[PDB]
């Protein structure tokens, strides 16, 4: 959810946290590949910029 | 509704609510207009008797700041008295330091800076006044200025301060203002003030008219309004 | 209301009304003007046997003919007494004469209600002033608010309602001295709680022919045993 | 506000100023054997701005360099204060002021602004350096009044990432040129992809004095330095 | 003069690798002496002394004020002080009383803290420094010590002949002087050690 | 309930420390076929009073990196211990 | 109502309520009436007491040889403005060696009371001045307010239940202008005997009259040159 | 966010302060547009007027304020802050002229005005003068200059400059226009200024609404154009 | 509840900023001094022991204040510069006034009055800094003092810093010494205390700091000693741990 | 009906903070003091030795003059300030008036300073209560006490600090009108009547109205406790 600070009092401790790996915001090269996905969801006929907004 | 206490603080949308509330304080005050002609500036204030307790000649909002400059205040009266004293002091410094009459632009800019300086800090409130400034000079002509409660000071041909701010300038602007000398403009201001609010909310009002221009040879004083008596014999002809 | 620099919607003194309330907790005192002279009395409310009775000040000496009594808070009274002593001496300096009691109390109430923390708090004491000016004897009563007035026989502090009522029962204009003294200590031992003896109360009488020694010292025992 | 401590923690208005520093433009500074290298990262918002008007790398004396990572409008204020103070030292002693004494007095000024209770702290972290008496120095300060001494450090966006690169890349013994090479490497690790003769702005400190490099030699050096 | 109120003479002389400073012992009012053990040469750190001549009030006052500022400097910075720094400090201290002037002529003589380089300088009553290579003098008597040191100085001097040269100069120029006499104290310092000798001067 | 007349003893659990942490270090490193011959004392110390089984979790983090040298457990605690981080507030 | 604490705060309807509260503090004083003829100005106030035995708190106080004020409200601010009034009088009496015109003095009073009504840290002055004076052009009857908006009249009345007094002043302000001192003063107390509830009557010891004249110096009277003023009356129309 | 209700000038969490970024649209309550351009040895200011009244004058609605004989400026935002900032600028330029004996360069003036705004920002209990100022001037050995001063105290200065209400669009047109490497032969500057305001506002109006302030290295005095020559430039770009 | 500023009292009555300055002391570097005649010593814990510093300062907690006095420090760091400069200036003004060194107790009470001036007034932050004192005089010899943010000062012989050091004071009481003035005994004791209380494994000498103050012939030299003797002290103490495991 | 500060009255007419700063005095260490006819005596309890320091600097009984003696309760820092200013004041009285300082003058000074400190803007009241014992005018023994309000209040015996009602109740039940031997034994009975009376935490100092302060030795007090126990056995 939007928050996780309301947590990790007993879930993240010796015994409970056995394989807990937070998954927050990543680096880049996603935005580009996401474009390549969502911009391909729309037409982008054959020649339409990608990086100018990357 | 959230943050409008101090005069230093801003809003979430970026304006000072103290200045707005002080601006609409003068809206409840008496109606005061002004207009210039090609050789003078004429003031006029709708002034009201309370019930029967006044003396018709007390607390006159037509002040007299310099030899050729006077005010036409409306709003809180004592604040206007203090501001008039500050204006007298500024004209005093200019007369003492340069030996000639103050130009109205420079006077208005000093007064606007003084009003702005009372709008700036958080210890003090903004002024609750809105007044007029007229002048005349042989090398400058007639000049009529205007100072809001915030401190924005620029020039007009005609203005109105009070309840009927729009409702005066609706028919102020249909005056052929350039081609008239001010001796016509006296009864013109008489009819303009007499149009607004004869009997509707209050019972009775009373007229004052200030007067500066070439005909006074550069002096500023109230008209001998009883001389030529130009309101009433035309006010009774302005109801039809 | 919180603060000495804000009025009420109606007519409340607040920073002063709470002081007029704070008077009421103090010990009582009764002074009575008579043309023969001004008499005055007070209650000490001695708590301990270790509480040495002559060290508690209620009647102090301002001038050779000007007495005093205090109320409520002790140290505001100490401030006003100190300054009052200083200023009468200044009057004697610049005039070779005695500052009259009305002028004394105007000089006190010039700053008896002048409390300002900027540009400190209002004082918490009621004062009874007696003296002999050129117009004979005078009895004077002020308040924290500086609203100073003459009173013929004023009672202060605790139980002052019944003090005023039973005082207005017995008092008139052509009273004598000793009659007023015993009438005062009758009101005292109706409003005090303990047994009246040599150590509870103290008198202060000033006469035009007996300007010096505005006090009775253990002849007060003889006065009490005459009731 | 600034007059009272927390129930247990620290001075939240100084922590927020440190966060505003950490949210600023990145920079890197390296102390080598003979000189100290400073380097900032100065991107214009548009293509309209000029690169000859505002200057990040700024000298305090002829042999003392100083960069920051924060707000220029406070930076210039405390720069002017440090100017006047260093010239007062040179009035008193007729000798160019040592960098430790500069950092003491600048820290005293910043501390005096952290005192109660109407002024805000600076949102500025300094990186002070100079070559006094042979051995060059490097002194980082902070809004809290504190100061440190570094061999190589960074401040700004991704200072943690740049610092973990500095721990791996840098060492004890280098020269000024190799220091500039690793400095533009660790600044190029975190900056945008287009890095030109104007996006960076680099001054050095030889023992012969402070030197603020030009776009000519900066463009000559960073023309694909590795 | 006001400089001749309590007498006084301070000589400092630079040698080859060492430096010698000497002064008189007499203290007294205009013609009446009091004692022969009045101190005018003070230690300011290691291998560096200062000499003060003129009104004794300004001597002790400026000496304590300078010790105040000196210890504040040596505690703010762990290193010891260079002599030019001390010279500039004394100049600033004297120039703060531009119109309220002390009546003193300070003489600084000390070694280098890093090397064995000697150093001498003198100042005026408003803070005018003067660095030389041979000798500086101060006090009431001037022309006597100028004639003696311009007669006797050599550029390259072993410390023994340095001691004897400053000894003969001080003895003859003091014995010709009237208001300054009654014994001589001599500090001859170097990198290795510090020597303080007192001479058998004429008690007349 | 805090009235002792309802429960006599009141015994918190002090987490393991250097001695205990090192013994449990050898323990949780027992069965996994690590890169044997490795200092576990620095691991116990790097645990600032870890909640007992945290040695097991660091073993899990280590083995994951290898998928067990001392460097494995080092990176294990590095994932574990980071935050605490973020100096510039000394 | 949480904006309704200090002088500095403008209201969202623009009416600073500290001024309104000071007005209401003025409304709880004693009744007093001032009115002028063409040649003589008379102000009459009402006394009260704390108890039966005590004396009455006075209202008409002297200022100068031709200036006298009435008062209502607070007494510390009353004596403060009294000392300032006497000070500014003896200031111009020293410098110009003339008696003061009244209008410039009351303008100085407004400019004095302006500062505690605009900055923070002083209260507006609870004050009830009724000023009678003589410049070259005859008697003047001015009144003040805690808002410093001083008025000139020909007959005013401030204090508790002073409105019936104002009705009397309405129905005799035409009659006021012609008469000499005696019936003028008894018109003033034919306002004060309606400033009172009808079940009690105005006695000697509770009333005070101060006359200033064009040739007559300002003088206060109490019970003895008021026993001449109290006769010449009939009862109220019961 | 806030939370803290941003009443005074403190630091909020993460990490900004809200007073100055509320002051940045006190310009936006002006309802006004300003454009400055530097291409070559000239520099051009253009700014329109919003006068709905015939009773109102036309000379005293001027926003171009001649600071000194070689330095001009234009103001937007609220008027009182602008005029007070202008008199501070004149006073400090005169202070330069008194202290240092020669005419002030336009850089030091912007630095001094920015420092005044920063001192007004650093210490609380004063409103931070919510107006924006654009300066122009000629300097020897540097040509013409165009500078911008922020209410925050962040000065900068650059080639094609715009502030007011609609200047994201103006800077979009000036990125799409100052990208071609042609010279700017002063009527190129006047034409691009008039047409950039004519494409941002899209009005194509009389010569009596905009004000044009120019300075050129042929007459280094600041100069305000007349209705005739404004009309001449407007019909000169009329094709 | 009754929080807002340093003034006024709480309803029992206690103080707010005093206890909270103490709880600002508790999370800081640990110091101590030892009972010794013919000398006195100091111990200190290195904050921020990261490898990319310089250590060119020779002193981060010690401040050699006059000539024959130094002082450790603990708490918020940058208030202490204001305090140390002012303290040096106080002692130096005393030396200017009398030409005799400051006898250290009126120095301590001067700094306590400086701190108490911000405890009483309003509204200012009180100094949340406790700090030690070693020194020598003509009237008592070697001394030890404990400044506190209230303005109270206690002359101890074995002192106390914050949350890391309650067990240190417990070891100092249970291992109390008297009569043995030998510096090496007190240093071995201090090594033992910092070995237990600090979490530095095997007591790396880069994480410690030791300065001493002895009386030498008329000088009262202050020995902020170097690292090699600390190394051989650690080796000596680990040999004493080998002596402690001779019981197996 | 709010909270802060020391400038506001209660809705029923009190000052909360004077009464609340009295509580810190009410919860402090005990110190008593009596006057004999020629020798005055007082002393504090709760030496509270923590086994490892000196205590010659923590002395709660000091002097301003050769005639007057101090004591306090409450917190000690306010006592340090008041004593520092009191020494200065006693010496400034010695500057003009050439008398030995009367006790009543210095108590009026302490109470006046304390009250003008309490009246002002946001200054925290001194939470102490001093005992000011001296004998100057014809060797007449006096002892006055103070209060955070600033009320000097002359007594003949006194008890402050923790459980002062019980201690003053013993002086009540002793205090006979009917000699420095009965006064020494009365001090012994008061310190035996202390809240703990451990025998070693007793600290007493006397003045014989011509001498200076005498700090006793805790072996003489041991024989005093022994003769008190002997009289307690003689009661049976």
Swiss-Prot record, chain A:
It is found in: Cytoplasm; Nucleus. Component of the 19S proteasome regulatory particle complex. The 26S proteasome consists of a 20S core particle (CP) and two 19S regulatory subunits (RP). The regulatory particle is made of a lid composed of 9 subunits, a base containing 6 ATPases including PSMC4 and few additional components. Interacts with NR1I3. Interacts with PAAF1. Interacts with TRIM5. Interacts with ZFAND1. Component of the 26S proteasome, a multiprotein complex involved in the ATP-dependent degradation of ubiquitinated proteins. This complex plays a key role in the maintenance of protein homeostasis by removing misfolded or damaged proteins, which could impair cellular functions, and by removing proteins whose functions are no longer required. Therefore, the proteasome participates in numerous cellular processes, including cell cycle progression, apoptosis, or DNA damage repair. Belongs to the AAA ATPase family. This is 26S proteasome regulatory subunit 6B. The chain holds residues 311 to 364 of 418 of the full protein.
From Swiss-Prot, chain C:
Its main location: cytoplasm. GO terms for biological process: proteasome-mediated ubiquitin-dependent protein catabolic process. One of its GO terms (cellular component) is extracellular exosome. Glycans are attached at residue 184. Expressed in fetal brain (at protein level). It is found in: Cytoplasm; Nucleus. The modification Phosphothreonine is found at residue 47. Keywords: Acetylation, Cytoplasm, Glycoprotein, Nucleus, Phosphoprotein, Proteasome. Pfam families: Proteasome, Proteasome_A_N. Induction: Up-regulated in colon cancer cell lines. Up-regulated in fetal Down syndrome (DS) brain (at protein level). May be the target of the transcriptional activator NFE2L2. The modification Phosphoserine is found at residues 8, 48, 55. SUPFAM superfamilies: N-terminal nucleophile aminohydrolases (Ntn hydrolases). The 26S proteasome consists of a 20S proteasome core and two 19S regulatory subunits. The 20S proteasome core is a barrel-shaped complex made of 28 subunits that are arranged in four stacked rings. The two outer rings are each formed by seven alpha subunits, and the two inner rings are formed by seven beta subunits. The proteolytic activity is exerted by three beta-subunits PSMB5, PSMB6 and PSMB7. PSMA5 interacts directly with the PSMG1-PSMG2 heterodimer which promotes 20S proteasome assembly. Belongs to the peptidase T1A family. NCBIfam families: PRK03996.1 (NF003075). This is Proteasome subunit alpha type-5. The lineage of its organism: Eukaryota, Metazoa, Chordata, Craniata, Vertebrata.
Curated annotation (Swiss-Prot), chain D:
Component of the 20S core proteasome complex involved in the proteolytic degradation of most intracellular proteins. This complex plays numerous essential roles within the cell by associating with different regulatory particles. Associated with two 19S regulatory particles, forms the 26S proteasome and thus participates in the ATP-dependent degradation of ubiquitinated proteins. The gene is PSMA2. Changing residue 102 to V: In a colorectal cancer sample; somatic mutation. It comes from Homo sapiens (Human). The modification Phosphotyrosine is found at residues 16, 68, 113. The 26S proteasome consists of a 20S proteasome core and two 19S regulatory subunits. The 20S proteasome core is a barrel-shaped complex made of 28 subunits that are arranged in four stacked rings. The two outer rings are each formed by seven alpha subunits, and the two inner rings are formed by seven beta subunits. The proteolytic activity is exerted by three beta-subunits PSMB5, PSMB6 and PSMB7. It is found in: Cytoplasm; Nucleus. This is Proteasome subunit alpha type-2. Phosphorylated on tyrosine residues; which may be important for nuclear import. SMART domains: Proteasome_A_N. The keyword Cytoplasm applies. One of its GO terms (biological process) is response to virus. Belongs to the peptidase T1A family. The lineage of its organism: Eukaryota, Metazoa, Chordata, Craniata, Vertebrata.
UniProtKB/Swiss-Prot annotation, chain F:
It is found in: Cytoplasm; Nucleus. Disulfide bonds: none annotated. Keywords: Acetylation, ATP-binding, Cytoplasm, Nucleotide-binding, Nucleus, Phosphoprotein, Proteasome. GO terms for biological process: negative regulation of DNA-templated transcription; negative regulation of programmed cell death; positive regulation of DNA-templated transcription; positive regulation of inclusion body assembly; positive regulation of proteasomal protein catabolic process; proteasome-mediated ubiquitin-dependent protein catabolic process; regulation of transcription by RNA polymerase II. One of its GO terms (cellular component) is proteasome complex. GO terms for molecular function: ATP binding; ATP hydrolysis activity; DNA-binding transcription factor binding; general transcription initiation factor binding; proteasome-activating activity; TBP-class protein binding; thyrotropin-releasing hormone receptor binding; transcription factor binding. The keyword Amino-acid biosynthesis does not apply. The keyword ATP-binding applies. It comes from the Eukaryota. Belongs to the AAA ATPase family. This is 26S proteasome regulatory subunit 8. It comes from Homo sapiens. The chain holds residues 305 to 400 of 406 of the full protein.
């Amino acid at each position: 959810t939007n928050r996780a600070d309301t947590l990790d009092p007993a879930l993240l401790r010796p015994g409970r946290l056995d394989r807990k790996i937070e998954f927050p915001l990543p680096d880049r090269r996603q935005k580009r590949l996401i474009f390549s996905t969502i911009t391909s969801k729309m037409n982008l006929s054959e020649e339409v910029d990608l990086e100018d907004y990357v | 509704t959230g943050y409008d206490l101090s005069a230093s603080t801003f809003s979430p949308d970026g304006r000072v609510f103290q200045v707005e509330y002080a601006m609409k304080a003068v809206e409840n005050s008496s109606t005061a207009i002004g207009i210039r002609c090609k050789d003078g500036v004429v003031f006029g204030v709708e002034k009201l008797v309370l019930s029967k307790l006044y003396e018709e000649g007390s607390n006159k909002r037509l002040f007299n700041v310099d030899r050729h400059v006077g005010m036409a205040v409306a709003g809180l009266l004592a604040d206007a008295r203090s501001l008039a004293d500050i204006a007298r002091e500024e004209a005093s410094n200019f007369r003492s330091n340069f030996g000639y009459n103050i130009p109205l632009k420079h006077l208005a800019d000093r007064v606007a800076m003084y009003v702005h300086a009372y709008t700036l800090y958080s210890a003090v409130r903004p002024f609750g006044c809105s007044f007029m400034l007229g002048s005349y000079s042989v090398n400058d002509g007639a000049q009529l200025y205007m100072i809001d409660p915030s401190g924005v000071s620029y020039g007009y041909w005609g203005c109105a301060i009070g309840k009927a701010r729009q409702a005066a300038k609706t028919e102020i602007e249909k005056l052929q203002m350039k081609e008239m000398t001010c001796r016509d403009i006296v009864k013109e201001v008489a009819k303009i003030i007499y149009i607004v609010h004869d009997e509707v909310k209050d019972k009775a009002f009373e007229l004052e008219l200030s007067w500066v221009g070439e005909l006074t040879n550069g002096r500023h004083e109230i008209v001998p309004k009883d001389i030529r008596e130009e309101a009433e014999k035309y006010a009774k002809e302005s109801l039809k | 209301d919180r603060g000495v620099n804000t009025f009420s919607p109606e007519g409340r003194l607040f920073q002063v009304e709470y002081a007029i309330e704070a008077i009421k907790l103090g010990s009582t005192a009764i002074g009575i003007q008579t043309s023969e002279g001004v008499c005055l009395a007070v209650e000490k409310r001695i708590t301990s046997p270790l509480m040495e009775p002559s060290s508690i000040e209620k009647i102090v000496e301002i001038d050779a003919h000007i007495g005093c009594a205090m109320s409520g808070l002790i140290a505001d009274a100490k401030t006003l007494i100190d300054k009052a002593r200083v200023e009468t001496q200044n009057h004697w300096f610049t005039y070779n004469e005695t500052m009259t009691v009305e002028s004394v109390t105007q000089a006190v109430s010039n700053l008896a209600l002048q409390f300002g923390e900027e540009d400190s708090r209002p004082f918490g004491v009621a004062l009874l002033f007696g003296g002999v000016d050129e117009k004979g004897p005078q009895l004077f009563h002020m308040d924290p608010s500086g609203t100073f007035v003459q009173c013929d026989a004023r009672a202060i502090g605790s139980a002052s309602e019944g003090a005023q009522s039973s005082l207005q029962e017995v008092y008139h204009k052509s009273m004598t001295l000793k009659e007023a003294i015993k009438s005062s200590l009758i009101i005292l031992k109706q409003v005090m709680e303990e047994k009246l003896n040599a150590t509870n109360i103290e008198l202060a009488t000033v006469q035009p022919g007996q300007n010096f020694h505005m006090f009775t010292k253990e002849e007060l025992e003889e006065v009490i045993k005459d009731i | 506000s600034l007059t009272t401590f927390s129930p247990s923690g620290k001075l939240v208005q100084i922590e927020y100023a440190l966060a505003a520093v950490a949210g600023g433009a990145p920079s890197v500074g390296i102390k080598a054997a003979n000189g100290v290298v400073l380097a900032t990262e100065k991107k214009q918002k548009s293509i309209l701005y000029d690169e000859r008007s505002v200057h990040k790398v700024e000298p305090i004396t002829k042999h003392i360099g100083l960069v920051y990572s924060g707000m220029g409008p406070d930076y210039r204020v405390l720069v002017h204060r440090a100017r006047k103070l260093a010239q007062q030292y040179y009035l008193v002693y007729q000798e160019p002021i040592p960098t430790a004494q500069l950092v003491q007095r600048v820290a005293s000024v910043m501390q005096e602004y952290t005192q109660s209770g109407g002024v805000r702290p600076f949102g500025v972290s300094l990186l002070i350096c100079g070559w006094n008496e042979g051995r060059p120095y490097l002194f980082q300060s902070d809004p809290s009044g504190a100061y440190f001494a570094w061999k190589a450090t960074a401040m700004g966006k991704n200072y943690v990432n740049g610092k973990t690169f500095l721990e791996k890349r840098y060492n004890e013994d280098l020269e000024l040129e190799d220091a500039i090479h690793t400095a533009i490497l660790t600044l190029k690790e975190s900056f945008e992809g287009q890095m030109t003769e104007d996006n960076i702005e680099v001054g050095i400190c030889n023992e012969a004095g402070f030197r603020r490099l030009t776009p000519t030699e900066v463009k000559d050096y960073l023309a694909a330095i590795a | 003069s006001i400089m001749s109120y309590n007498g006084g003479a301070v000589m400092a002389m630079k040698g080859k690798n060492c430096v010698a400073i000497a002064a008189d012992r007499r203290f007294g009012i205009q013609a009446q002496m009091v004692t022969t053990d009045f101190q005018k040469i003070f230690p300011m750190g290691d291998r560096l002394y200062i000499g003060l001549a003129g009104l004794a009030t300004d001597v002790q006052t400026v000496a304590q004020r300078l010790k105040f500022r000196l210890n504040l400097y040596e505690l703010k910075e762990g290193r010891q002080i260079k002599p030019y720094t001390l010279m500039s400090m004394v100049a600033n201290l004297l120039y703060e009383k531009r119109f309220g002037p002390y009546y003193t002529e300070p003489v600084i003589a000390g070694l280098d803290p890093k090397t064995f380089k000697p150093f001498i300088c003198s100042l005026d009553l408003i803070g005018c420094p003067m660095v030389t290579d041979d000798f500086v003098v101060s006090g009431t008597c001037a022309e006597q010590m100028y004639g003696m040191c311009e007669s006797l100085w050599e550029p390259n001097m072993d410390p023994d002949h340095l001691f004897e040269t400053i000894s003969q100069a001080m003895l003859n120029a003091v014995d010709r002087d009237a208001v300054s006499g009654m014994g001589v104290i001599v500090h001859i310092i170097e990198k290795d050690k510090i020597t303080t000798r007192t001479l058998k001067a004429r008690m007349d | 309930l805090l009235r002792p007349g309802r429960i006599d003893r009141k015994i918190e659990f002090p987490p393991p420390n250097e001695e205990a942490r090192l013994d449990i270090l050898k323990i949780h490193s027992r069965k996994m076929n690590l890169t044997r011959g490795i200092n576990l004392r620095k691991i116990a110390e790097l645990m600032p009073g870890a909640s007992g089984a945290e040695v097991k979790g660091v073993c899990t983090e280590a083995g994951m990196y290898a998928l067990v040298t001392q460097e494995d457990f080092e990176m294990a605690v590095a994932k574990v211990m980071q935050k605490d981080s973020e100096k510039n507030m000394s | 109502n949480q904006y309704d604490n200090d002088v500095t705060v403008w209201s969202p309807q623009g009416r600073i309520h500290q001024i309104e509260y000071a007005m209401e503090a003025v409304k709880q004083g004693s009744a007093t009436v001032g009115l002028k003829s063409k040649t003589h100005a008379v102000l009459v106030a009402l006394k009260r007491a704390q108890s039966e035995l005590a004396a009455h708190q006075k209202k008409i106080l002297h200022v100068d040889n031709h200036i006298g004020i009435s008062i209502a409200g607070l007494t510390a601010d009353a004596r403060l403005l009294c000392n300032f009034m006497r000070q500014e009088c003896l200031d111009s009496r020293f410098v110009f060696d003339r008696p003061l015109p009244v209008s410039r003095l009351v303008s100085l009073i407004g400019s004095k009371t302006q500062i505690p009504t605009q900055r923070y840290g002083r209260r507006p002055y609870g004050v009830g001045l009724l000023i009678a004076g003589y410049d070259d052009m005859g008697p003047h009857i001015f009144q003040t307010c805690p808002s410093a908006n001083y008025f000139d009249c020909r007959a005013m009345s401030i204090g508790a239940r002073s409105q019936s007094a104002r009705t009397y002043l309405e129905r005799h302000m035409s009659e006021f202008m012609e008469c000499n001192l005696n019936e003028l003063v008894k018109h003033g107390l034919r306002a004060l005997r309606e400033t009172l509830p009808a079940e009690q009557d105005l006695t000697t010891k509770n009333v005070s009259i101060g006359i200033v004249g064009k040739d007559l110096e300002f003088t206060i009277y109490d019970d003895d040159d008021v026993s001449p003023f109290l006769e010449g009356l009939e009862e109220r129309p019961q | 966010s806030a939370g803290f209700d941003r009443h005074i000038t403190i630091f909020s969490p993460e990490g900004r302060l809200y007073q100055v970024e509320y002051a940045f649209k006190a310009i936006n309550q002006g309802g006004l547009t300003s454009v400055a351009v530097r291409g070559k040895d000239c520099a051009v200011i253009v700014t329109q007027k919003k006068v709905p009244d015939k009773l109102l004058d036309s000379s005293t609605v001027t926003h171009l304020f001649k600071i000194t004989e070689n330095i001009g400026c234009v103001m937007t935002g609220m008027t009182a802050d602008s005029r007070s900032q202008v008199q501070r600028a004149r006073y400090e330029a005169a202070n330069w002229k008194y202290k240092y004996g020669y005419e002030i360069p336009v850089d030091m003036l912007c630095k001094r005005i920015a420092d005044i705004s920063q001192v007004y920002t650093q210490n609380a209990e004063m409103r931070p003068l919510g107006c924006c100022m654009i300066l122009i001037g000629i300097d020897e050995e540097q040509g013409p200059q165009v500078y911008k001063c922020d209410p925050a105290g962040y000065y900068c200065g650059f080639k094609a400059t715009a502030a007011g209400v609609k200047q994201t669009e103006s800077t979009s047109f000036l990125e799409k226009k100052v990208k071609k490497k042609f010279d700017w032969t002063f009527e190129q500057t006047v034409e691009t200024a008039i047409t950039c305001l004519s494409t941002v506002l899209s009005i194509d109006f009389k010569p009596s609404e905009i004000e044009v302030g120019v300075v050129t290295v042929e007459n280094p005095k600041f100069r305000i154009l007349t209705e005739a020559e404004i009309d001449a430039h407007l019909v000169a770009l009329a094709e | 509840r009754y929080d807002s500023r340093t003034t006024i009292f709480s309803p029992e009555g206690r103080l707010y900023q005093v206890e909270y300055a103490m709880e600002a002391i508790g999370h800081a570097g640990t110091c101590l001094g030892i009972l010794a005649n013919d000398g006195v010593l100091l111990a200190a814990e290195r904050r921020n022991i990261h490898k990319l510093l310089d250590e060119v300062f020779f002193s981060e907690k010690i401040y050699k204040l006059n000539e024959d006095m130094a002082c450790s420090v603990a708490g918020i760091t940058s208030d202490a510069n204001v305090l140390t400069n002012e303290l040096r200036l106080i002692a130096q003004r005393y030396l200017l006034q009398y030409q005799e060194p400051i006898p250290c107790e009126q120095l301590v009470t001067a700094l306590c009055d400086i701190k108490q001036a911000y405890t009483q007034f309003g509204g200012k932050r009180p100094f949340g800094v406790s700090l030690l004192y070693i020194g020598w005089d003509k009237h008592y010899g070697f001394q030890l003092y404990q400044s506190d943010p209230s303005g109270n000062y206690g002359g101890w012989k074995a002192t106390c810093i914050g949350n890391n050091s309650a067990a240190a004071v417990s070891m100092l009481k249970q291992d109390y010494k008297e009569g043995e003035m030998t510096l090496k005994s007190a240093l071995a004791l201090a090594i033992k205390v910092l070995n237990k209380t600090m979490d530095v494994s095997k007591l790396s000498a880069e994480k410690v700091e030791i300065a001493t103050l002895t009386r030498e012939n008329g000088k009262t030299v202050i020995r902020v000693l170097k690292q090699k003797e600390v190394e051989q002290l650690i080796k000596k103490h680990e040999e004493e741990e080998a002596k402690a495991e001779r019981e197996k | 009906s709010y909270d802060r500060a020391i400038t506001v009255f209660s809705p029923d007419g009190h000052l909360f903070q004077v009464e609340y700063a009295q509580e810190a005095v009410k919860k402090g260490s005990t110190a008593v003091g009596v006057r004999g006819r020629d020798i005055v005596v007082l002393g504090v309890e709760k030496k509270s030795v923590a086994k490892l320091q000196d205590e010659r600097t923590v002395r709660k009984i000091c002097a301003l003059d050769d005639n007057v003696c101090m004591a306090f309760a409450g917190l000690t820092a306010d006592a340090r300030i008041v004593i520092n200013r009191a020494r200065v004041e006693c010496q400034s009285h010695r500057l003009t008036v050439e008398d030995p300082v009367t006790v009543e003058y210095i108590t009026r000074y302490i109470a006046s300073l304390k009250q003008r400190y309490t009246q002002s803007n946001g200054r925290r009241p001194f939470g102490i209560s001093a005992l000011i014992v001296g004998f100057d005018f014809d060797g007449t023994p006096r002892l006055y006490q103070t209060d955070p309000s600033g009320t000097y209040h002359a007594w003949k015996a006194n008890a402050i600090g923790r459980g002062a009602k019980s201690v003053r109740e013993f002086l009540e039940k002793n205090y006979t009108d009917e000699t420095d031997d009965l006064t020494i034994k009365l001090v012994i009975k008061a310190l035996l009547e202390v809240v703990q009376s451990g025998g070693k935490n007793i600290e007493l100092a006397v003045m014989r109205r011509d001498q200076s302060l005498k700090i006793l030795n805790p072996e003489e007090i041991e024989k005093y406790v022994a003769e008190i126990e002997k009289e307690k056995e003689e009661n049976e």
